[PDB]
């Protein structure tokens, strides 16, 4: 039984104190969908070059938007597709962008009337197409914030979906998550996707700012457009769950020593373990609170976290055999 591990560390400077970051891989290159707001707001498409992020486009200037929007990126081997959708301030309006080089995006605008997610919360994320019987689908998924009462499984996690790139969003996709608690409330739900495998990553707890616990749910087919999803555990003593990814059909799972995130652990198949200790040379405490995986392929993946200024620590993680 072979195991090969290697760890690299690279730093990146960003002149933009992005309110929220959204990395994705296209070609071999790394990209970020930055959001800057504090009157005027920017959605930069930055790209990693040598040692620093390089802004390439301000999608948001095409606007006709009012304020901060939900962002939905979808990356294929062929072309990136980026949607800028208004959140509720009643049928959805979005701006579609697409590029087959990562540099020159083409503009478009779409409207989905009577849209399936009419009373659901949404959060921005990056994603990959979901193959289904020779039909790949982009999913915009929304979760009900918190359920006060009556037991019902209808739309605890609802998704509307498109198989024509981003152009039309007709299809409905139902998720049956067989779980409930009274004061529990979900946040930041995103679909992890790998081949045909659908999964969801979200935070649980009472209403936002006091979120703590991570939850992850694998999904399996019931119909062509209906999934049943059961919770998958990842708890470890004196460690807080952080993020989940796959390498070679195996899980790689990060944790922190506790909620202050002084150190981060990477766990390969819950067998091998790596410790990332952030070196500190600033008056600010160094930590890995934002750390997230960015899959490259079945062997390589990144672990990224920012710090005091726009200093993106980036661990290049190799693990194979």
């Amino acid at each position, epitope marked *: 039984r072979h195991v090969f591990i290697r760890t690299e560390l690279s730093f990146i400077k960003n*002149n933009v104190p992005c309110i929220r970051d959204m990395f994705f891989i296209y070609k071999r290159e790394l990209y970020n969908i930055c959001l800057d707001d504090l009157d005027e707001t*920017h959605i930069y498409v930055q790209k990693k070059v040598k040692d620093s992020w*390089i*802004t390439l*486009n301000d*999608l948001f200037k095409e606007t*006709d938007l009012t304020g901060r929007p939900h962002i939905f990126a979808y990356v294929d081997v062929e072309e990136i597709i980026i949607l800028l959708c208004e959140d509720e301030e009643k049928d959805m309006t979005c701006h579609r962008f697409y590029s087959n080089d990562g540099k*020159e995006y083409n503009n478009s605008e779409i409207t989905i009337s009577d849209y399936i997610l009419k009373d659901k919360l949404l959060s921005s994320y990056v994603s990959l197409p979901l193959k289904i019987e020779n039909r790949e689908y982009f999913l915009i998924c929304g979760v009900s914030p918190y359920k006060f009462k009556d037991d019902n499984k209808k739309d605890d996690i609802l998704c509307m979906a498109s198989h024509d790139k981003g152009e039309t969003w007709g299809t409905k996709i139902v998720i049956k998550y067989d779980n409930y608690k009274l004061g529990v409330q979900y946040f930041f739900l995103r679909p992890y996707i790998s081949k045909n495998d659908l999964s969801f990553h979200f935070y649980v707890g009472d209403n936002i700012n006091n979120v703590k616990n991570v939850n992850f749910i694998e999904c399996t087919h019931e119909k062509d457009l209906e999934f049943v999803c059961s919770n998958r555990d990842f708890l470890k003593d004196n460690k807080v769950l952080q993020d989940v990814s796959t390498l070679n059909d195996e899980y790689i799972v990060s944790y922190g020593n506790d909620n202050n995130f002084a150190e981060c652990y990477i766990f390969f198949n819950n067998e091998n373990s790596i410790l990332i200790k952030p070196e500190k040379y600033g008056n600010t405490t160094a930590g890995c609170y934002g750390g997230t995986f960015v899959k490259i392929d079945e062997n390589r993946t990144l672990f990224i976290y920012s710090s005091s200024q726009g200093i993106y620590n980036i661990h290049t993680i190799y693990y194979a055999n």
Partner: antibody
Amino acid sequence: NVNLLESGGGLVQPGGSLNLSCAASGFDFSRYWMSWARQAPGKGQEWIGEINPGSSTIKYTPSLKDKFIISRDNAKNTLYLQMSKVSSEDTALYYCARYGSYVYAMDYWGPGTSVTVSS
Amino acid sequence: SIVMTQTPKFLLVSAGDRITITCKASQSVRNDVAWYQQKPGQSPKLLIYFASNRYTGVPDRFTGSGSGTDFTFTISTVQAEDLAVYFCQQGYTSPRTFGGGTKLEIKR
């Protein structure tokens, strides 16, 4: 092949009014942001203002906010700058310019046209 | 209103020489900076956008860089056609103010 042309320049007495037009052709005029800038003699470029294709978003330099007003007609492919209550500071060569795709930069300038304010 | 201080102002140099103007802003302006050239008798032409990107059709000799407060514009091999007035502009927020300009003339 992009082309712009300014019009309406000339002399105007101080405290007066003047209209400036900019015709555009060779590209989709309703597809791009538009902007005004100006050059005082012997001095660097001064940005004036900008407007989005739907005219919903118009922005000015703070000094000119109550003097000039920018507008555009997509049906006529024309940008407009309405000036009034001018003083000697406004004597300048005025440029109208297009923003580039996904950039707040002037990717194409017109030749401009002169404006002089004197008694 | 942000202010853009440009150093230097006059540059006299021979052909084949490198040059590098710098532009310092009063506040952080992220990566949004443009560099323009206007040859005498000409309207300004765009050359650099987002501090370090070529515009289409821009010859390779022109480059830009810098972070945060400060930025640089650079010509690798100055030519007689490059006699001109170069200047920076901040695109981060309105007003999108220009710099003071930099005349560039050549030895012969």
